[PDB]
């Protein structure tokens with residue numbers, strides 16, 4: 001109930017919201033059907049439109065007008081944004097040369113530069129170049145301030161998940177808004193775009209910027225605008241709030257455009273009808289900037305122009321139908337469109353079976369345009385699993401397609417020509433970022449970055465301490481002139497042991513054998529220096545990774561590689577080795593095919609055994625440093641140490657062998673040497689975080705050898721590839737992956753072919769940030785470089801995407 005009989009006189013766009021059943025005059029009242037009877041009349045004036053004309057100049061203040069051109073308007077804060085241009089001989093903001101803003105130039109009583117967030121739905125990154133002729137205001141912000149060629153959205157590249165990710169620094173799996181439509185089984189309730197349920201606070205996790213601001217005494221006012229309030233009125237209202245007395249005036253503002261997304265759905269991302277919505281958004285930006293110039297705030301305010309996601313070409317005839325794959329298509333509920341999520345239609349159905357559903361959806365048609373996954377098998381870069389609202393069965397849909405349950409769902413619902421929601425690495429889904437103001441850099445281009453990083457920077461810009469989030473604070477310091485946040489490296493928690501030779505061969509009873517019984521003082525002092533770490537500056541280029549949790553581990557040195565060997569998990573946490581461009585691939589000698597050798601630095605009780613692998617009919621083993629890349633036949637023996645062995649499914653050894661035998665050398669040749677760090681990952685509860693031992697769900701049969709859910713590799717070289725990986729003076733270049741450790745290759749439809757036709761495509765799909773690997777392992781990499789820490793934070797957030805330009 002609202003008793004809508006109260007009045008909005010003197011209250012238009014009030015900043016504190018009043019409680020029921022008192023009527024409201026704030027910018028969201030419409031959306032709640034709670035505005036006072038006179039809100040439209042008083043608060044939403046339209047008379048004479050939005051601009052001044054020559055003959056309005058100096059007029060008698062008529063309060064009925066939408067905005068004013070009277071003489072008192074400047075100090076009333078309510079002029080039309082073009083007032084000074086039309087009536088006072090001034091120029092539009094876009095026509096002025098840009099001049100570096102070295103310091104904030106603010107009026108008396110401003111404690112900090114205000115932040116204005118200009119957010120645009122569906123604004124695809126390539127619009128900046130392709131629409132540049134019709135967006136002069138946006139182009140000036142772009143070229144004069146700081147910009148990225150694009151910003152990466154989160155998955156799914158839908159509106160609600162991304163806008164709330166922008167606001168919280170959080171992955172959708174942690175903030176709770178995992179789709180535009182959701183079912184929460186604990187609530188037993190559904191969330192939808194259309195309707196009132198999306199208003200209930202229990203859906204919304206984390207702590208969005210407006211709450212973070214409020215809690216730390218920065219005034220945020222009211223960010224969100226009921227949909228029918230026109231853009232011009234939003235802009236005028238922001239400008240009016242900026243004229244409030246210091247004690248009442250917010251420090252952060254937001255504007256939101258439903259465009260160009262609204263038109264992009266209808267006409268496609270590059271339909272000829274798209275030029276007009278771009279012009280219109282530019283005009284709105286021009287109004288804001290002219291309005292700021294009027295208030296003398298145009299060299300005071302920090303403006304962020306930012307999008308939620310792009311837009312792809314998608315038509316109804318590119319729809320895959322699940323009825324063409326499943327017989328039982330009525331026992332399922334599908335969330336459909338540019339992603340798919342499947343659950344059982346009825347909880348009382350124990351005839352429902354996820355395994356049979358996945359299998360029926362797996363490589364069934366030759367050009368199939370979606371791929372089923374159990375959510376825990378999705379690429380780890382998507383961070384899309386650890387939420388009860390994310391259904392177990394997920395369909396990653398190819399760009400340009402839709403998935404639907406039955407054809408009737410599409411025509412009892414071609415209308416649309418655009419859509420979004422696809423994998424967040426897809427070019428058409430990329431979006432924009434521009435920062436302009438005293439705190440941003442002048443005329444600076446920065447590399448693409450993920451939208452999860454922005455919350456920390458918005459906090460920096462406002463002097464706030466960010467709530468805990470998924471950004472890496474400091475990774476975007478290079479966008480800023482000042483207010484940088486100066487992070488320190490985490491402290492190492494566990495120190496390694498450096499074991500020497502402590503055990504005799506006969507003390508091991510591992511069931512392992514090796515044909516290695518063949519016999520010189522020159523080369524004997526050699527192998528001693530090698531086991532003491534004499535080649536370690538070769539193979540460990542950036543210092544050893546720090547272990548950030550409590551555990552017991554040994555550093556092991558070898559001619560060709562160095563490892564941090566975990567006495568708890570009985571395998572390395574990490575193995576580090578450098579392959580120069582000149583290096584040669586040899587094969588495994590025949591006599592050494594099943595060779596596994598005891599490591600006399602490591603006790604039997606902290607070693608794996610070969611017997612367990614023999615008994616375990618599903619599981620085989622691999623090595624972290626590959627025998628193929630040994631520097632000499634004698635060094636090869638080291639690669640067969642039981643301390644270099646890790647458990648691997650035979651299906652997975654196909655992937656791993658191809659990567660080690662073929663790809664590592666190829667990367668070394670192309671990148672002028674590479675440093676490699678590889679190791680296992682255990683993430684049985686799919687939370688993106690290292691498992692403790694009591695979380696491991698699977699062991700090599702009859703043993704305490706834990707089975708990794710994934711294997712990672714981090715491959716670093718010199719950004720300037722004229723310098724070899726081991727002698728680099730400047731910035732680094734990285735690519736990484738987190739390969740799922742699976743007992744089959746069902747994920748790759750062409751896996752019955754030669755690895756040269758499918759393995760690399762699998763790896764690219766499972767591309768990762770070093771940061772993702774750090775969360776999954778509790779390790780901290782790049783501890784000792786000559787590079788600044790902020791630059792190294794940027795490198796750890798890099799994702800190599802394998803899209804073209």
Ligand SMILES: *[C@@H]1O[C@H](CO)[C@@H](O[C@@H]2O[C@H](CO)[C@@H](O[C@@H]3O[C@H](CO[C@H]4O[C@H](CO)[C@@H](O)[C@H](O[C@H]5O[C@H](CO)[C@@H](O)[C@H](O)[C@@H]5O[C@H]5O[C@H](CO)[C@@H](O)[C@H](O)[C@@H]5O)[C@@H]4O)[C@@H](O)[C@H](O[C@H]4O[C@H](CO)[C@@H](O)[C@H](O)[C@@H]4O[C@H]4O[C@H](CO)[C@@H](O)[C@H](O)[C@@H]4O)[C@@H]3O)[C@H](O)[C@H]2NC(C)=O)[C@H](O)[C@H]1NC(C)=O
Nearest residue numbers: 173174175176204205206386387388468469470687688775
């Ligand atoms: C990305 O960044 C985020 C943010 O930093 C990272 O997420 C954090 O990770 C922490 C570790 O997983 C986690 O810390 C735990 O907090 C527990 C209390 O949680 C509540 O309080 C916070 C603070 O206000 C709040 O944010 C939480 O909100 C969650 O839940 C509500 C709904 O219930 C949602 O609205 C909201 O979106 C959010 O959901 C997400 O998180 C939960 C888990 O918290 C997921 O299940 C959801 O799916 C969703 O993803 C909560 O309201 C606290 O109780 C924990 O303590 C346990 O462990 C410690 C060890 O230190 C130990 O002392 C205790 O034994 C305790 O265990 C007991 O509870 C167990 C569970 O029932 C039980 O099994 C045991 O037997 C014990 O009884 C713990 O400290 C933190 O909550 C989240 N924060 C957020 C916002 O998600 C995320 O990790 C980063 N991601 C990556 C990939 O890096």
Ligand SMILES: COc1ccccc1C1CCN(C(=O)c2cn(CC(=O)N(C)C)c3cc(Cl)c(C)cc23)CC1
Nearest residue numbers: 117119160163164166167209223224225254255256306
């Ligand atoms: C970059 O933007 C930042 C950054 C930080 C803090 C805040 C912001 C913006 C986000 C967008 N802003 C909005 O007004 C929103 C408009 N919609 C669409 C809508 O309501 N419909 C029915 C289509 C939203 C949806 C969500 Cl889920 C959210 C969380 C916000 C909005 C303004 C504030």
Ligand SMILES: [Ca+2]
Nearest residue numbers: 683689690691
């Ligand atoms: Ca985990």
Ligand SMILES: [Cl-]
Nearest residue numbers: 158179180181
């Ligand atoms: Cl969705």
Ligand code: NA
Nearest residue numbers: 613616619620
């Ligand atoms: Na076996």
Ligand code: NA
Nearest residue numbers: 745746748751
């Ligand atoms: Na296959």
Ligand SMILES: [Zn+2]
Nearest residue numbers: 122159261265
């Ligand atoms: Zn849309």
